Ligand SMILES: NC(=O)c1ccc[n+]([C@@H]2O[C@H](COP(=O)([O-])OP(=O)(O)OC[C@H]3O[C@@H](n4cnc5c(N)ncnc54)[C@H](OP(=O)(O)O)[C@@H]3O)[C@@H](O)[C@H]2O)c1
Ligand SMILES: NC(=O)c1ccc[n+]([C@@H]2O[C@H](COP(=O)([O-])OP(=O)(O)OC[C@H]3O[C@@H](n4cnc5c(N)ncnc54)[C@H](OP(=O)(O)O)[C@@H]3O)[C@@H](O)[C@H]2O)c1
């Protein structure tokens with residue numbers, strides 16, 4: 001039974017991921033920041049399924065919280081096999097009106113946070129000479145998007161970072177890959193607001209917004225599949241056709 | 245039970261693919277060109293497993309053979325759900341000594357053949373408003389490789405072609421993706437010869453050549469997964485770190 | 489004074505390229521297939537400018553014509569410094585209605601022709617331990633386009649091919665790069681017809697179709713610049729924002 | 733005469749860029765952080781050439797300094813036509829031993845600094861409905877590199893950011909492109925130390941390290957060429973063959 005750490009597992013994509021790895025019987029550390037109750041329900045579901053779960057409230061943009069989150073999984077089970085860096089937020093605004101704080105917040109969490117988590121997981125994984133790290137980026141990091149210079153910067157940064165992380169870990173058998181989802185129905189997407197959501201829908205060749213379960217399916221393949229042990233330093237896009 | 249057509253399924257990657265989709269209980273048309281006996285054994289294995297199989301000898305670079313191959317699956321089962329365009333060959337030589345026939349043969353099979361197969365599958369899939377097409381390319385189509393201008397051209401061509409194929413089929417719900425494998429141990433690779441095979445091995449970050457089963461695993465995800473229904477027009481690389 | 493061979497130099501982009509390299513004083517072989525008169529006028533203009541020019545009617549999809557075209561420049565001047573593989577055509581149609589002849593014609597010229605020309609130039613360039621080859625592809629080879637599976641395949645193929653060509657020539661100091669233009673106003677584009685041309689115009693972030701001179705400017709940099717001697721195996725896109 | 737602002741113009745690439753745009757007669761704001769004397773000499777050279785120059789000491793990772801740097805060019809000449817975001821540093825170390833301060837410093841300058849500069853230039857350029865922004869990234873942002881997770885993250889981030897910047901500015905006719913150099917002989921590269929520099933040299937197909945003038949040549953094309961007005965949201969690589 002693999003030990004999986006999923007950041008931002010209380011809602012949306014991270015939650016679908018957590019439930020799916022639980023249903024496959026993994027030991028899952030469900031991290032949350034503010035949604036304690038929602039994480040607990042996730043833990044309970046994983047359990048009803050036969051997986052094992054421990055909830056952990058911590059801000060992944062803070063080193064202390066990150067070192068603590070890893071410690072909790074290691075104290076509970078003996079190691080960490082997989083880490084899915086999913087936590088993220090948006091602070092949308094045209095480049096011309098963007099406040100430095102809007103830039104910093106997105107960068108601190110979405111980019112630096114992924115660095116902290118990856119670094120922490122890696123030190124543990126090096127010793128065991130095995131592990132998998134999956135970072136959730138976005139198609140926006142690839143093809144940009146109006147009103148999202150901050151988010152685009154952070155997501156693109158996750159990709160360049162994951163590639164070096166892949167190179168450094170190759171020696172100790174640690175796979176590092178990135179998943180780039182397109183428009184997925186979640187709370188993050190509910191914020192851009194309906195008339196806009198519809199607008200985006202005519203932009204998607206497959207004419208359908210993706211579901212959190214769609215991403216989880218792909219993450220599950222990368223995390224558990226024996227085949228995926230030969231995949232590193234790559235970005236995998238599930239976007240229904242946007243970034244063709 | 246999905247009906248899957250796999251070209252070049254008598255040996256290497258196509259065979260691993262055929263066996264794996266059979267073990268999952270699909271109805272598999274195992275195509276072969278010259279290895280009749282080896283295809284039959286594949287058919288038998290699929291059967292021992294509980295999948296269904298029909299062997300079909302045909303050259304996929306010929307329209308007639310292609311239209312015939314599709315007909316045989318349609319006469320047998322009622323439709324085709326998935327087509328995996330795997331058949332391919334190499335005719336290596338420096339650009340400076342390359343004969344037009346060495347260029348043509350690689351192009352006719354590896355590129356035009358994929359066009360023929362995709363076109364044929366698509367006409368059938370459009371009517372049913374559903375289907376998945378997976379084309380096997382190569383990392384060489386992405387980053388080139390000395391002694392393989394012909395193969396690089398054809399493989400890169402498969403990618404551009406698959407992207408348009410993805411756009412045209414999006415409307416009728418047909419997913420088209422490409423898989424780009426790195427060095428995989430097979431008969432194709434056995435031909436470059438040992439001292440060379442070793443040389444290539446120090447070029448692979450994960451320090452391991454891939455196995456046909458590694459590719460099959462990924463193809464199986466793309467062919468069968470509900471998650472993969474949201475993936476189109478993308479190239480997926482399994483190369484142990486070469487093309488990072 | 490560099491000797492430059494430009495294929496398809498009688499009209500559109502190839503012509504703008506020919507005129508611009510002539511105005512910079514190069515010796516230019518202006519190739520044409522059917523537009524003899526238009527090539528002659530190009531030759532005359534180059535001359536009025538102070539460059540030197542020789543017209544050559546030949547089909548670049550034929551080996552004989554290609555070997556002949558190279559011979560003519562070599563007999564005239566002592567060598568070839570730059571080759572710009574520009575000749576190309578389109579045979580648009582949905583994948584579902586595409587005749588094999590429509591596929592073949594686009595592939596024979598746009599892909600194989602580039603192989604023939606590059607191969608011929610390379611054998612000459614290897615001996616001199618210097619040279620530059622610039623292949624004109626298209627943004628379509630990168631992001632696909634409905635109604636152009638053939639063209640997309642050929643253009644993408646040009647890219648993979650150019651990358652291997654770059655690797656093989658690196659040793660003898662031969663640079664090989666690709667230029668990918670977006671929508672450029674020319675006879676090729678006049679064929680898609682007005683209501684369509686307007687439609688495409690709202691797709692271009694810079695809201696302007698490109699001009700043949702725009703491409704020539706970039707080709708001139710790659711062909712003549714001392715800086716461009718450090719650039720190989722790359723694709724350069726001038727598309728006013730389509731493929732961001 | 734275009735007004736060009738070049739960040740980090742006292743040494744290496746930024747300096748070659750400054751000299752070259754000066755020799756073409758632009759008005760150049762040469763920014764520096766600590767090398768006041770070296771910037772002055774650059775200013776003098778530009779002048780001996782017939783260009784115009786004003787030196788400006790400021791840290792481009794600070795908003796105040798950035799707003800001040802723009803003000804100085806605007807007070808001097810009436811506007812800004814081109815901004816080249818060149819300033820950058822490295823803080824190399826394996827991911828496993830990387831201090832948060834080593835991460836932050838590289839991110840603050842190389843990524844956030846580019847945001848500050850681009851934002852400032854853009855507000856000015858929007859009003860004039862014209863301008864060009866060229867951000868210097870690195871091939872490392874594309875293909876990663878051991879010991880440089882921080883730098884790779886920042887450089888990749890510059891690319892995603894530049895793409896959104898391109899989209900937002902398209903409307904007001906502002907071009908935004910990125911240049912990705914490979915190994916260039918400069919003080920930045922002198923720091924990795926000789927036995928390493930030699931090692932890297934056998935990795936370069938063209939078997940030559942690039943020169944600051946090579947990058948300047950390409951930047952000059954993008955900054956001044958009428959042709960480059962049709963180029964946006966793209967990354968241009970000069971790396972002698974590394975990232976093929
Ligand atoms: N939705 C899309 O269309 C789309 C497209 C591409 C990529 N993505 C990416 O997918 C990931 C999740 O997508 P989403 O749509 O699922 O968003 P969401 O519904 O808003 O969920 C974000 C999650 O992040 C957690 N979180 C926020 N700040 C955190 C912090 N400082 N530390 C630790 N956890 C934190 C939240 O937990 P609490 O509520 O408990 O605080 C929450 O579970 C993000 O990386 C997002 O960028 C989404
Ligand atoms: N091996 C690698 O490292 C690698 C890396 C990247 C991509 N790939 C690709 O993977 C696919 C298969 O790999 P491989 O290594 O499996 O090669 P392989 O062991 O040589 O098998 C090639 C297969 O193609 C079939 N075939 C050949 N010509 C055909 C034709 N004209 N029509 C129909 N079927 C034909 C052969 O069947 P018969 O013997 O019955 O004639 C055989 O089953 C190819 O597309 C290859 O390019 C391989």
Ligand SMILES: NC(=O)c1ccc[n+]([C@@H]2O[C@H](COP(=O)([O-])OP(=O)(O)OC[C@H]3O[C@@H](n4cnc5c(N)ncnc54)[C@H](OP(=O)(O)O)[C@@H]3O)[C@@H](O)[C@H]2O)c1
Nearest residue numbers: 496499500501520521522523547548575576626672674676
């Ligand atoms: N126009 C665009 O928007 C666009 C976008 C991307 C790429 N491109 C590419 O740019 C190149 C030229 O563009 P274009 O728009 O300039 O097209 P064009 O105006 O139709 O000109 C094509 C040229 O090719 C020559 N040619 C045709 N067949 C030939 C053959 N078999 N052998 C030798 N020369 C031949 C023609 O010469 P003759 O008339 O004398 O026969 C003509 O000068 C092509 O590779 C095209 O794919 C164009």
Ligand SMILES: NC(=O)c1ccc[n+]([C@@H]2O[C@H](COP(=O)([O-])OP(=O)(O)OC[C@H]3O[C@@H](n4cnc5c(N)ncnc54)[C@H](OP(=O)(O)O)[C@@H]3O)[C@@H](O)[C@H]2O)c1
Nearest residue numbers: 740743744745764765766767791792819820870916918920
């Ligand atoms: N060298 C390469 O191989 C290579 C490869 C790819 C990309 N690049 C990029 O090229 C750019 C320059 O390359 P380089 O090799 O030229 O480096 P360099 O020789 O070390 O020069 C860096 C420059 O940045 C300036 N600078 C440093 N910190 C600054 C700050 N906070 N604010 C404003 N200016 C600052 C320095 O000025 P002062 O000394 O006056 O403080 C100096 O002129 C960087 O973005 C680097 O990443 C270089």
